[PDB]
Design a protein around this ligand. Structure first.
Ligand SMILES: [Zn+2]
Ligand SMILES: [Zn+2]
Lengths: 335, 335
């Protein structure tokens, strides 16, 4: 009763009872920036798995996408909002219906796994059991079974992929959205972000005081963490490709980019008014399953931004509402 | 170290190994405003239990206190920060060591129970099991056993007091801090916030369109929710009074106030440079146990604010750090 509604008219045009169930994984990345992706022209092979799938036509790359801000606190709630970046007031985002609320009201079975921090309020109106902490191991009070593969005891993003079949089997003949919130490229200690298999650009910086290390060694650790994210996305897609009774999709966007020493600036979090372009420039990818019914939108005049996520998610679940009239999306609506 | 440190020099002057363990309950209230508390002169007995304890000298009233902002998203992280309101940056509060991080490092056993939303990042570095969701019942994925006493199935703040003895028993001979984050006076549906026992100021507004109801009936439901918070604070104190083995304290402050129709303004969330006084004026109370060693501090000339919380918590746990010099606190350090 106490929510500012945006999509009270929302209804599904078709349901899992009259066509194949829809199964979407939305990956909320962390600190990855567009121009260190090989698929956007970076001079190093940072996403070999995604590049191969792009060459096969399975993954669609949207190029240099713009985040709404330079921090998770700002970007993550706005990513799932109806307000968009221009009218978004990070302070009062929680008073509004968000796109997760709409999908849950229409019967989509939502799971949010988090190896980062939390959903920044997005999940607060749904039952607590639909949100799972994956930045802690079970004895620490969380769920991630892949935290002891490295000397930092840091939980890994691929632990969020363990037995997602549980959720799918609990929700037969239902549309499903799974949100995975990555640790990704968070710094400054990039060398802690990936297991040794991905320690490929060398040597790396092994200190949290970035200014002290040499700039190239900071970049090397950052690009190694991208390699681990490329693998995590590949394993996510491999799991979806085995769900042959559903129509599947994986959408991936980072929450913001990262400065890597341009004009001496490192990290992120700068007020958007004068943040450098590197902090606002993010990768964006969409994978679609075999025999997909969906059509990918072409990059419009203005390019894409975080504002396209909410209409995309509504389109992937066939939701009709005036709330998305004339709004950019990564996928066209079906009719 | 990926954390911006503020109290790296912190050390306890004495420990539970050489004096009585310290046991502190910090209540983070919600939407209660100073001038509707009967202990600040409101012409209605909204806090009858606290008023009796104030008359006995057991509760100290700090009068009209100022919150740092007009929403929980802004105020809650700042309440636990070292930066204080004037340097605080809500987007990047999470990058900084906060007072809970300091207490945890020094060995205080911290429990955060939340019947509101969550800790707004404050608990993110501590093990997940030290944070408990109390706005959901157990079958919903939370912990609160008192959600079915009302027709809205709304979880009640007193459910957070159920069997706190479990936490105390698990931390024998340790200092303990318990944070209880209230649902409290959140609106606009004030009439949902309290069980029938507290439906005392009548008639009440039973709609969410507050500008439609008669103003006094909105005020009546708001004041009923205060009665239920007064009762919750009394039950909290009654539990602490039974921990005779420890030196105890209860500190209570709201996250912000509330407009109740003055010049047509309702609810809160206005930008703090422009917000009316009602949204920034909050109650603040301190209860101390029998034979307390602590003394109430000199009032700042402008009155107290949220900035006093962090130095107060440090002083209550005998923590010595340069980060408290020059800073306001509700109680003096022991020396
Ligand atoms: Zn981020
Ligand atoms: Zn609040």
């Amino acid at each position: 009763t106490e929510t500012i509604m945006h999509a009270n008219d929302a209804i599904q045009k078709t349901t899992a009872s009259t066509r194949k169930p829809r199964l979407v994984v939305m990956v909320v990345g962390e600190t990855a920036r567009a121009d260190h992706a090989s698929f956007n022209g970076y001079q190093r092979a940072t996403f070999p798995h995604m590049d191969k799938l792009i060459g096969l036509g399975q993954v669609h790359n949207f190029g240099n996408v713009t985040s709404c801000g330079t921090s998770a606190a700002y970007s993550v709630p706005c990513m799932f909002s109806y307000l968009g970046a221009e009218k978004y007031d990070v302070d009062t985002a929680d008073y509004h219906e968000n796109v997760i609320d709409t999908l849950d009201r229409l019967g989509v079975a939502i799971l949010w796994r988090d190896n980062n921090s939390d959903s920044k309020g997005v999940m607060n109106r749904l039952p607590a059991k639909q949100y799972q902490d994956y930045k802690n191991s079970p004895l620490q009070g969380g769920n991630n079974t892949i935290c002891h593969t490295n000397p930092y005891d840091e939980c890994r993003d691929v632990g969020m992929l363990v037995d997602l079949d549980d959720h799918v089997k609990a929700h037969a003949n239902q549309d499903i959205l799974i949100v995975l919130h990555q640790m990704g490229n968070h710094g400054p200690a990039y060398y802690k972000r990936y297991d040794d298999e991905f320690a490929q650009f060398l040597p790396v910086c092994t200190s949290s005081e970035l200014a002290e290390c040499e700039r190239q060694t900071v970049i090397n650790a950052y690009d190694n963490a991208l390699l681990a994210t490329d693998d995590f996305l590949k394993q996510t897609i491999d799991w979806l490709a085995a769900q042959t009774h559903a129509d599947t999709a994986m959408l991936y966007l980072s929450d913001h980019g990262e400065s890597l020493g341009e004009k001496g600036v490192y990290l992120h979090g700068m007020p958007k008014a004068f943040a450098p372009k590197e902090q606002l420039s993010i990768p964006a990818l969409l994978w679609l399953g075999a025999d997909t019914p969906f059509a990918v939108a072409n990059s419009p005049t203005a390019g894409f931004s975080h504002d396209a996520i909410t209409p995309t998610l509504l389109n992937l679940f066939d939701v009709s509402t005036q709330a998305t009239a004339d709004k950019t999306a990564f996928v066209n609506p079906l009719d």
